């Protein structure tokens, strides 16, 4: 991918770039999943051994405060601002807010809301004044790449994301193990209740949570499961990685062309009875200028 930017890339030191990042040492891990309830179209399988070079990855998804500093330094205009609208979950649209009649096929709970963007995540009248440490949302893949490049960083590949998110466990269901709520404690911000009608907020949040909410995983990463979907670098496919080759098993970058970029980790909307996509092996995608109230990103970097 060759992006184009309207701002110069600032000079940064290695110690500056590394702040708030964890160093993931080079090695192998078992990527993917073979849960028999996985949707075949998602291509969670096959489970395979992948070797990665050492890399750095953010402990936290990029926050509102951090994205605001990027915009202040660059004047960057997000895709949602250029389009003039972004997707908001229906329960979070205040009554009377102007809305487009647009319907996402098979997902009527998404509302296209004029004027919804990162600083007004539910549309005109909303603000992030009380969410400075929440993950930035309504950021497209393009916006995420622009931020990461400005920060001296990049998006993680899907394999880097999953190795970091698995936190040193071998083929566990979640970042922390195989139980959703070990010892009866919530470990991530997903949906409880009846999707999409009523979120009981049993885990504390019926929207995004601060980027440092909940226990981290074994590598020190926070909210890799739940909270917000996270953009990765790869083009999406369901079967490129089924090939057993160096390109798919050693620092794999995904297919060279595609239509949608990979997103990982699930969000505050995921639930077992609809998508079941908060398992660490889960994956989906979205087109690269798309944005939504449940999608953000964390950065990676080469040491």
């Amino acid at each position: 991918h060759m992006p184009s930017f309207d701002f110069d890339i600032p000079r940064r030191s290695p110690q500056e770039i590394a702040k708030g990042m964890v160093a993931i040492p080079g090695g192998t891990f078992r990527m993917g999943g073979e849960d028999p309830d996985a949707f075949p179209e998602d291509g969670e399988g096959p489970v395979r051994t992948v070797r990665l070079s050492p890399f750095l990855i953010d402990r936290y998804a990029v926050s509102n405060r951090q994205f605001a500093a990027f915009v202040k330094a660059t004047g960057y205009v997000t895709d949602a601002e250029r389009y003039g609208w972004s997707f908001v979950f229906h329960a979070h649209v205040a009554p009377g807010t102007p809305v487009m009649d647009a319907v996402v096929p098979e997902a009527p709970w998404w509302v296209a809301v004029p004027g919804a963007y990162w600083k007004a995540p539910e549309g005109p009248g909303s603000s992030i004044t009380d969410r400075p440490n929440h993950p930035v949302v309504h950021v497209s893949w393009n916006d995420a790449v622009a931020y990461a490049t400005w920060a001296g960083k990049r998006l993680p590949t899907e394999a880097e994301w999953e190795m970091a998110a698995r936190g040193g466990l071998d083929q566990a269901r979640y970042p922390w193990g195989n139980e959703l709520t070990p010892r009866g404690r919530h470990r991530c911000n997903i949906w409880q209740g009846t999707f999409p009608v009523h979120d009981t907020g049993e885990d504390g949040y019926t929207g995004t949570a601060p980027v440092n909410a909940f226990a981290p995983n074994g590598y020190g990463l926070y909210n890799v499961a739940g909270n917000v979907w996270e953009w990765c670098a790869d083009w999406w496919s369901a079967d490129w990685h089924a090939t057993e080759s160096p390109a798919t098993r050693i620092d794999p970058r995904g297919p060279e062309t595609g239509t949608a970029r990979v997103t990982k980790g699930g969000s505050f909307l995921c639930h077992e009875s609809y998508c079941n996509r908060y398992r660490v092996a889960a994956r989906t995608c979205n087109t690269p200028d798309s944005s939504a109230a449940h999608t953000g990103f964390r950065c990676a970097a080469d040491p």
């Binding site: 949707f39 179209e41 998602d42 389009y83 997707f87 487009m100 647009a102 319907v103 996402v104 096929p105 098979e106 997902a107 998404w110 296209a112 979907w229 949608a260 997103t263 699930g266 969000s267 909307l269 995921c270 609809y274 998508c275 079941n276 996509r277 989906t284 995608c285 979205n286 087109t287 200028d289 798309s290 939504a292 999608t295």
Partner: peptide, 14 residues
């Protein structure tokens, strides 16, 4: 009835 949808795309509403 079809694959659940978690990533709403701008193209999908056209």
């Amino acid at each position: 009835a079809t694959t659940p949808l978690c990533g709403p795309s701008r193209a999908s509403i056209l």
